[PDB]
């Protein structure tokens, strides 16, 4: 592991020198999810500290259209471009326009090279045989650059990206090294705890609006209040102690049996938002609402951006519970499915997964677009959603993805027939 | 005085709405002194809080060449330009290239209109009869916009700008409104104290490197250490109590009865750099060292930028003391002048100013850049260095600023252009 870092240091040192020796404009382009906003915040601090002024933009997708602007800014003052949480998938277009560019990304690379020509450096873990889907995120990649300047305090934002991208359980590889370094330097403390304690609000509200896990029977202030009163816990306290947690867990297993999902390693970070899980949810909610610059402000610990983030998070959480309660969940033999709204199908399907895969879809043109979600126990028993969603090219469509999460597209009149086929495939995968 | 705010608030509400309704790129341009960097920090926090991404650049002078650049950025994606601590004098060039712009400035305006055309809003307090040299700074103008959003916490950076532009004594007009609003919202507390206690270092170092007041007989660690041990004060302590204060005051006033400003009204602000006087000096030092992004970072309370800022401040103050010893004051008819190094010219001028204006300069390539300072005593008798230094037009350049402090540039005719300035200063006297 010290040897893999030694191979990565060759690329991070070159990136450091490229930034230090550049004196023109610097453009930072990052993504709007939690990992992208955290990357933006790491880069903003690192650049300010090295005396670089910069123009930071947050985009939703690095399309051909987006890259073809930007290239218009190249014509006079050819800036140094730093792409974060994107860039590897689109590297051909970036080479095409001859950007002076640094790419910090963990998406599977199209070109598996760290040095592309004389003007492009690509830092992507897959090039060193690190699995970017489980062992490092974009914010960790930006952090590997920052630590060449000795900015170990920025490790707290790398951890936020680890949570946002669901790479915290298990904690593997470079991610595990990053957390250990942060703990050694005392920027993070690690504490096993119950998930409701991360919110620092009234516990009955923490339970009412939780979606990790979502417990339908408890998903309202009234039912959560009553449940806590019954087992003798003060519903208005803001942290459950050890006695409260034993009583809660003993009682809740009857409404939600997989109570291991209620226990997590909490990360208490050196940041004004001290709970990394809470900061991750805040950045998500702010990014989903288009408040990109507020999200950067939160990473930079601005009081007012944090106050906006708190207000937006709880509106986001209340609205998500409302959306969840409006789902008309329909059951086949081995799956559930539902029709919902274009924006949140996959978000809703992942939250709804309990014992069987969940497939959501929305109708667009004549198209119908599906999002399929499973869990780890489902995969261990033999689920593979990309094989089952591939059957879309049997009904004049297309489908695929990962074993635990896949999509598909299939003409609007084949919905029932496509789902029957998917249901039967999954049934057989699990025997 | 509350009536003059009502007139300003019509321009700050229009600025607020112009920023809110803009969804393209935003360019912020400020200067590198304490007032410009503080304005950059105010605008950075204000813009982020209103969900605006932006590109900030710091220039030392808003030259015609700089304006022609920047203007090339309007060809595709026409940004909204926010000019802070600049733009009012250059207004005709900004109009000429048809920027979408907001101008936040306290220099004497060229056009005395708030609402120039369809595209430009100029917020300049001179237009409402506020004295931009004694009653408000660029920081305070930026803060007047920010308070339209309720961002009262940003008053701490306006206070830093007030100090950096030497408008804290006396504290007048809009600057006094801002300080009292800050104290009312509990973002500042005011405390009368000896100047040397603002540094939180060993007193013999706080004295040796102090330049307000500058005491040449004590401007070394050696003599400062000995002066304190001879009057009963432990020179290694970092804060002076009342007894050591009265002992140091009378000992200093005895041997130097002309000395002034040993007791100041300290401003303790809600900021990681709690002493606004120290924050002012720190921003000046990093700005003079070209560390523009670090200074913004310091305003935004980044721990590492503050660390750099402390290290750079003390290197700078030591460089400054060495240069005050070796500087060569020279007399003419009605000005003093000198040559020196880039980051020291304006500050040495104002430390030395006593009986007549001082103009420093440094040669940077083919050009000489000047810094003229008077006092409020000399503008009382009609100085205005902005009229005096504008005669660089006669020498292939330009000039301007405030009545009490101005600059000028070009070229190798320093001596010829110097004494065309001592001329005006007696026609003005
Ligand atoms: Mn990611
Ligand atoms: Mn100023």
Give a description of the structure:
- Two copies of one chain form a homodimer.
- By secondary structure, chain A is of the alpha/beta class.
- Among the domains of chain A are: 1-191, inorganic pyrophosphatase (n-terminal core) (Alpha-Beta Complex); 330-430, Diaminopimelate Epimerase, Chain A, domain 1 (Roll), CATH 3.10.310.30.
- Chain A is 42% helix and 15% strand.
- Chain A contains 17 helices and 13 strands.
- The first copy, chain A, has helices spanning 2-20, 34-49, 64-68, 91-96, 138-146, 155-164, 173-184, 203-208, 221-230, 242-252, 276-288, 292-299, 303-325, 345-352, 376-380, 385-390, 415-429, and strands at residues 26-31, 55-59, 80-84, 100-104, 120-123, 188-194, 263-269, 330-331, 336-339, 358-362, 369-373, 398-401, 405-409.
- In chain A, the strands form three sheets. A six-stranded mixed sheet of chain A has the order 8-9-10-11-13-12.
- In chain A, strand 10 and strand 11 (369-373) form a beta hairpin.
- The longest helix of chain A is centred in the C-terminal third of the chain and has 23 residues, at 303-325.
- The radius of gyration of chain A is 23 Å and the shape is globular.
- The A-B interface holds A 25, 45, 47-58, 69, 72-73, 76, 151, 153, 290-294, 296-297, 300-305, 308 and B 25, 45, 47-58, 72, 76-77, 151, 153, 290-294, 296-297, 300-305, 308.
Instruction: Just name the CATH architecture of the domain at 1-191 in chain A.
Output: Alpha-Beta Complex
The chain-level structural class of chain A is alpha/beta
Small-molecule binders here are: manganese (II) ion
β content of chain A, as a range?
Answer: 5-15%
How widely separated are the two ends of chain A?
39 Å
| SS element count, helices of chain A | 17
PDB class: dna binding protein
Keywords: Recj2, Mn, complex, Methanocaldococcus jannaschii, DNA binding protein
Assembly: dimeric
Entry title: Recj2 and Mn complex from Methanocaldococcus jannaschii
């Amino acid at each position: 592991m010290m040897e893999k870092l030694k191979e990565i240091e060759k690329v991070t040192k070159a990136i450091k020198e490229k930034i230090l020796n550049h004196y023109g404009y610097i453009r930072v382009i990052t993504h709007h999810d939690t990992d992208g906003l955290s990357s933006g915040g790491i880069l903003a601090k690192m650049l300010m500290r090295t005396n670089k002024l910069f123009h930071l933009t947050v985009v939703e997708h690095l399309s051909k259209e987006v890259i073809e602007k930007l290239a218009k800014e190249n014509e006079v003052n050819k800036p140094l471009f730093i792409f974060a949480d994107m860039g590897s998938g689109q590297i051909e277009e970036i080479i095409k326009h001859n950007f002076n560019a640094i790419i910090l990304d963990h998406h599977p690379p199209v070109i598996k090279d760290s040095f592309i020509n004389e003007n492009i450096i690509q830092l992507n873990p897959h090039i060193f045989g690190v699995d970017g889907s489980r062992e490092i995120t974009a914010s960790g990649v930006c952090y590997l650059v920052a630590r060449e300047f000795g900015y170990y305090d920025l490790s707290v934002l790398a951890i936020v990206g680890i949570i946002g991208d669901m790479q915290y359980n298990p904690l593997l590889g470079l991610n595990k090294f990053i957390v250990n370094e942060a703990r050694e330097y005392r920027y993070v403390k690690i504490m096993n705890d119950i998930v409701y304690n991360i919110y620092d609000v009234e516990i009955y509200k923490a339970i009412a609006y939780c979606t990790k896990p979502y417990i339908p029977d408890l998903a309202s202030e009234g039912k959560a209040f009553k449940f806590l009163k019954d087992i003798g816990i003060d519903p208005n306290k803001k942290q459950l102690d050890d006695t409260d947690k034993k009583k809660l867990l003993s009682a809740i297993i009857f409404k939600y049996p997989k109570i291991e999902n209620l226990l997590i390693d909490r990360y208490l970070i050196e940041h004004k938002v001290r709970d990394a899980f809470l900061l991750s949810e805040m950045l998500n909610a702010v990014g989903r609402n288009g408040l990109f610059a507020v999200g950067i402000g939160i990473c930079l610990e601005d009081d007012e951006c944090i106050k906006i983030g708190n207000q937006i998070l709880w509106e986001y959480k209340k609205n998500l519970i409302n959306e969840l309660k409006s789902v008309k969940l329909k059951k086949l033999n081995n799956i559930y499915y539902f029709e919902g709204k274009k924006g949140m199908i996959g978000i809703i399907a992942s939250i709804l997964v309990d014992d069987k895969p969940v497939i959501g879809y929305h109708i667009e043109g004549d198209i119908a677009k599906f999002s399929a979600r499973g869990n780890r126990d489902l995969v261990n028993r033999g689920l593979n959603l990309s094989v089952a969603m591939a059957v879309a090219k049997e009904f004049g469509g297309n489908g695929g993805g990962h074993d635990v999460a896949s999509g598909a597209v299939v003409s609007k009149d084949k919905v029932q027939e496509f789902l029957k086929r998917v249901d039967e495939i999954i049934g057989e995968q699990l025997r």
